[PDB]
Amino acid sequence: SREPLLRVAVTGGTHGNEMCGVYLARYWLQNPGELQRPSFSAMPVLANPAATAACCRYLDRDLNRSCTLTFLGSTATPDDPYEVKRARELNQLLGPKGTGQAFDFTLDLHNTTANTGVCLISESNISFNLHLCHYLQRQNPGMPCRLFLYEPAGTETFSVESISKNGICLEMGPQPQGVLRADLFSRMRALVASILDFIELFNQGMDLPAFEMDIYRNLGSVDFPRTADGDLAGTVHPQLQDHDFEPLRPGEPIFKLFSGEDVLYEGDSIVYPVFINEAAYYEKHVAFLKSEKIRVTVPALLR
Amino acid sequence: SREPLLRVAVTGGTHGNEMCGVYLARYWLQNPGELQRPSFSAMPVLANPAATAACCRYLDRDLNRSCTLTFLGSTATPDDPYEVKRARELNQLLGPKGTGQAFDFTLDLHNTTANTGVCLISESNISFNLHLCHYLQRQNPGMPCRLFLYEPAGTETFSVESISKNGICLEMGPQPQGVLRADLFSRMRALVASILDFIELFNQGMDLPAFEMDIYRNLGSVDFPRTADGDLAGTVHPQLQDHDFEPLRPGEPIFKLFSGEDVLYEGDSIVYPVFINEAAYYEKHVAFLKSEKIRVTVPALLR
Ligand SMILES: [Cl-]
Ligand SMILES: [Cl-]
Ligand SMILES: [Cl-]
Ligand SMILES: [Cl-]
Ligand SMILES: [Cs+]
Ligand SMILES: [Cs+]
Ligand SMILES: [Cs+]
Ligand SMILES: [Cs+]
Ligand SMILES: [Zn+2]
Ligand SMILES: [Zn+2]
């Protein structure tokens, strides 16, 4: 017995310098009509108002890492990081996380400086999210739309979309932080419209037969090569740069050191690097994430 | 009677989030050998240490707009912007500006999120700078190396390189702020080496015969389309994005509004837009600069 998704949010500016989501959220707040469908209206939300006003990723800490139950359930304090305070507001608005009052679905919009193209980022393999990705793939022949599965591996989910009963991140790159490209703005705007169309079809009872699809599952990160003092000793190798989701094979170059030497991948198997050279990840010690490409069977969603 | 250039500086991190210059300056500070030539050694300088440590363009104000004689000659104050304080240090180091103690040449390194490719930015048409550009063009067949002339039009020059008797900015894009690409790092490193080779040949007495070359001269800026509240109402049109230094003709699209309409260029003549969609220029109200392409005659530099 299918439950429609009637409480749906689209969040932008979770990171204040990722410009598509910032400007889409700002635009929809003045022009909500675009987010309405017959069965439901999506609420646009500017997730990090202060980082957005300042055009930076975050003020005190990364909002998209502050939505764990531990943070949300913490006793308030004047000294709390801004984004912890804001996370608690989002929990009031779209949660409380893990309870029956939480929103049905939150679509959280992101941009990356990595050449990811269009990808959906999910913290679990819930079949609805896979059907959604498949639907976007179908609506956009020739346009890659990949699903990146990032299981928290324990213990606590941490993202803004995790506050809702379900949700997903739409990530689009490459785009410099603080830069709004018309091409990505329009594409994201059209993909959001399609995601809302999908929710509408789902609500109206569309049968979604079982299928198989390739997805990418997080294996873990690789840091930039560093000096003893943890400064960069090199950066992403020219042959790896811009090649997100493409096979990286053992013995292939992953970094170029300032001293001139190549650093080769020393893994035992082929992996698929994602988020290659994201500005925001330098301080996180991630030059790229390794993923495994796996073919999964997606259960039917039938009335 | 030619005067050699013996006091030469290469400045990086004038803007703390432009990563090629940041990491080249950091690397050369530990490995200066690369900046030595028979007749002279270039001194590497990290221009904005605090913005660089924080990986942002500036802390209080843009350092590359703080080197006017007015700022440099201002009475110090605890309340002074950080970059005004730092500008005064650079004036002590490489100046004082407009006096005989100033450095012979400062090469200031920049990155832009605009697709400029390689360009040299000069605040005057001094023939040495044009010969330099021509030499780089010759050393790199097939690689555009364009000269952008940005006369202050009065009254005061404002850049870090303007502190020295002469100088120039080497600008390379596109690169996201906070991202270091190996390809641009190596290219800038090789161009710096060539600039130093040129200074060495000049010092050793190379004759530089007169020639003609095309350059681009600043006409002024065009702001993003804005709402009454000065927020973005659109961004750079997809047909203009990434097309720096290419002809923009009257009647051609320059912006795409969020409402869907195109904004067309309404100028009387063809211009050549530069710095199209630079992150740092949003707050400066510049979506691009208009330039005129002009063929100039460059005087010989003979012993
Ligand atoms: Cl489906
Ligand atoms: Cl990439
Ligand atoms: Cl020449
Ligand atoms: Cl551009
Ligand atoms: Cs509608
Ligand atoms: Cs790719
Ligand atoms: Cs040398
Ligand atoms: Cs170009
Ligand atoms: Zn993000
Ligand atoms: Zn700069």
CATH topology of domain B1-222+271-303: Aminopeptidase (3.40.630)
Report the alpha-carbon distance of residue B281 to residue A128 in Å, rounded.
42
CB neighbours of A294 closer than 8 A, spacing ≥ 6? A214, A215, A216, A217
Tokens of B278: 């630079």
Q: How many CB atoms lie within 10 A of CB A113?
A: 26
Does domain B223-270 sit in CATH 2.20.25.160?
yes
Start-to-end CA distance of chain A, whole Å, equals: 6
CB contact under 8 A, B176 and A174: yes
Start-to-end CA distance of chain B, whole Å, equals: 6
Residue limits of CATH 3.40.630.10 in chain B: 1-222+271-303
Q: What is the full DSSP assignment across B42-103?
A: EEEEES-HHHHHHTSS-SSS-GGG--SHHHHTSPP-TTS-HHHHHHHHHHHHH--TTSTTS-
CB contact under 8 A, B235 and A186: no
CB neighbours of A220 closer than 8 A, spacing ≥ 6? A289, A290
- In Å, what is the CA distance from A66 to each residue of A9, A54, A88, A89, A122? 18, 19, 9, 12, 17
| Dihedral (Cα; A12, A15, A17, A21), 10-degree rounding | -20
Residue limits of CATH 2.20.25.160 in chain A: 223-270
Report the alpha-carbon distance of residue A294 to residue A43 in Å, rounded.
34
Amino acid, res. A72: L
A115 touches chain B (CB under 8 A): no
Q: Tell me, what DSSP letter sits at residue B246?
A: S
Segment (H or E) for A143: none
Strands B105-111 and B8-12: parallel
- Answer yes or no: are the C-beta atoms of A263 and A288 closer than 8 Å: no
Who among B174, B180, B279 is closest to A235 (CB)? B180
Q: What is the full DSSP assignment across A260-275?
A: SPEEEP--SS-B--BS
How many A from CA of A267 to the centre of ligand 6?
A: 21
3-state secondary structure of A277: coil
3-state secondary structure of B262: strand
Tokens of A38: 């017959």
CB contact under 8 A, B235 and A185: yes
Report the alpha-carbon distance of residue B137 to residue B130 in Å, rounded.
11
Q: How many CB atoms lie within 10 A of CB A142?
A: 4
B27 touches chain A (CB under 8 A): yes
What are the strands of the beta sheet with A253-257, ordered from one edge? A234-236, A253-257, A262-264
What are the strands of the beta sheet with B145-149, ordered from one edge? B36-37, B40-46, B8-12, B105-111, B166-173, B117-122, B145-149, B211-222, B288-298
Report the alpha-carbon distance of residue B154 to residue B169 in Å, rounded.
19
Which technique? X-ray
Amino acid, res. B301: L
Residue with tokens 């990160």: A221
Phi first, then psi: give them for residue A253, nearest 5 degrees. -70, 130
Strand blocks (E) in chain B? 8-12, 36-37, 40-46, 105-111, 117-122, 145-149, 166-173, 211-222, 234-236, 253-257, 262-264, 288-298
